[PDB]
Structures are given as C-alpha cells and as structure tokens.
Amino acid sequence: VXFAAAIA
Amino acid sequence: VVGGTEAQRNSWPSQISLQYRSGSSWAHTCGGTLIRQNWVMTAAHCVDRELTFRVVVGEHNLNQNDGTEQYVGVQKIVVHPYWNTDDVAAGYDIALLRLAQSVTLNSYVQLGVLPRAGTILANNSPCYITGWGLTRTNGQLAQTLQQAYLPTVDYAICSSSSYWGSTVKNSMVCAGGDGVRSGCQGDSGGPLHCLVNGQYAVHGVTSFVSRLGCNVTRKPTVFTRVSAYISWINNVIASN
Ligand SMILES: [Ca+2]
Numbered sequence: 001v002x003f004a005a006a007i008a
Numbered sequence: 009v010v011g012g013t014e015a016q017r018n019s020w021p022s023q024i025s026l027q028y029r030s031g032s033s034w035a036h037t038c039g040g041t042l043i044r045q046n047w048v049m050t051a052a053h054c055v056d057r058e059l060t061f062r063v064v065v066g067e068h069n070l071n072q073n074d075g076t077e078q079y080v081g082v083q084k085i086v087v088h089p090y091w092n093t094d095d096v097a098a099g100y101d102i103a104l105l106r107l108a109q110s111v112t113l114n115s116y117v118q119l120g121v122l123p124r125a126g127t128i129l130a131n132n133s134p135c136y137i138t139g140w141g142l143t144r145t146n147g148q149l150a151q152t153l154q155q156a157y158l159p160t161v162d163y164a165i166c167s168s169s170s171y172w173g174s175t176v177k178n179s180m181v182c183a184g185g186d187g188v189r190s191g192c193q194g195d196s197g198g199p200l201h202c203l204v205n206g207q208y209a210v211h212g213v214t215s216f217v218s219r220l221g222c223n224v225t226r227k228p229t230v231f232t233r234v235s236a237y238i239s240w241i242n243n244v245i246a247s248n
Contacts, residue, residue: 005191006051006101008096
C-alpha cells in the first residue's frame with residue numbers, strides 16, 4: 001500500500 | 009532508493025528501519041525519522057494494520073551487526089485522524105510512534121530537525137532521500153542504507169497535468185522526477201533531508217510513487233510535507 005511506497 | 013549510493017554511517021543518524029515481528033524474526037517494511045528520544049515519525053500507510061512493530065536506530069546493514077543498533081519497541085501508534093487508507097492522494101499520510109523505551113543518542117543516533125511551520129522550499133532545492141528500499145523498480149531491498157540526491161519540484165510544476173496533476177496537494181512535497189533517481193518500495197515513511205542555510209531538516213515523509221514504476225520521468229517521489237503538520241505533531245507529543 002503493497003508492500004510500502006503507497007501507489008499514485 | 010533507485011539511483012543512489014551507500015550512505016556513510018554518520019550522515020543520517022535520524023533514519024530508522026521500521027520492522028514488524030514475523031514469526032521468529034523481524035522484517036523491514038518502512039523507514040521513519042527519530043524526532044524525540046522516544047518518538048518516531050513515519051507514514052500512516054505503514055502502520056495502518058494491527059501488527060507488532062519495532063524501530064532500529066543506528067542501523068546501517070539490515071542483516072549484519074553494525075555494533076551501533078538499538079532495537080526499540082513501538083508501544084503507541086498515532087495516525088493522523090483524517091488519514092484515509094483508500095485515498096493516499098488526499099494526504100494526511102503521517103503517523104507518530106511512541107517508543108517503549110527511550111534511545112541513547114550518539115554519533116549514530118540523533119534527532120532529526122524539522123522545519124518551521126509553513127516552510128515551503130524554493131523549486132529545485134537540494135535534498136537527499138534515504139532508506140533501504142528497492143534499488144530498482146521491482147527489484148530487491150538494499151541491505152545497506154542508500155541515499156540519492158533528489159531536488160524538490162515546486163507545487164506549481166508538480167501539480168501541472170504533465171506531472172501529478174490534481175493528485176498532488178499543497179500539503180505535500182514532490183522531489184526528483186528525472187527518471188534516474190527516486191524513492192522505491194521499502195523507502196516510504198522515511199525522510200527527505202533538505203539542505204537549507206547550511207543545515208539539514210526533514211521536510212518530507214515518503215508517501216507515494218507512480219504505479220508505472222519508481223524512477224518514472226515527471227512522476228517525482230511524493231512526500232507528506234512535514235511543515236504542514238508541526239502543530240499537530242507537537243500536540244501529539246505533548247498529549248502523550
Ligand atoms: Ca545491522
């Protein structure tokens with residue numbers, strides 16, 4: 001938010 | 009961090025590795041910034057779930073003993089109340105973590121200086137991003153802390169349709185966008201260190217990138233603008 005950069 | 013290099017050990021003593029307990033061991037998931045001896049600043053999307061977290065200060069190598077690490081539990085997670093898990097582009101991607109114990113400061117562990125409330129950097133201001141994230145889109149984590157030069161892209165440029173358009177908000181800082189250097193998976197929650205009047209301060213909390221990839225030209229890495237949350241931060245600290 002994946003895995004986190006969130007993806008946008 | 010794509011396009012970066014291995015940082016030296018004393019360059020970014022405020023960087024921490026956020027990790028969740030996974031069975032026998034722990035797992036790097038995010039970055040963060042030590043802002044008090046017992047408080048860390050990270051992204052809300054990193055701590056959205058109910059897991060057991062710890063932060064490592066004085067970390068350099070994720071899976072080797074650097075001799076400098078303090079492994080500190082997170083007792084409290086404080087997400088910004090307006091954070092919306094399903095709309096990162098709305099902003100408010102920030103959270104504070106009260107540590108179970110206070111850390112000891114040394115040449116490898118220091119508080120990260122934050123900017124004054126409302127500070128907006130001029131365009132193309134010099135900054136570095138740091139973290140253990142992927143070193144290429146769809147690659148693997150960096151074992152050693154990486155840094156990349158990542159100058160700011162001001163709001164007027166970053167919110168134009170060729171860049172992020174309406175996806176970026178004024179409560180954010182964009183940086184990079186040259187197609188060579190950027191933040192990448194595993195960097196989020198970490199700092200953007202920007203050099204102003206000779207000294208560094210953490211102006212950003214890494215938040216998001218393009219679905220097309222990390223180092224995508226005209227899709228600079230987007231950070232929560234720390235200077236927009238200074239009063240919220242101080243009052244979380246003062247109330248806990
Ligand atoms: Ca280590």
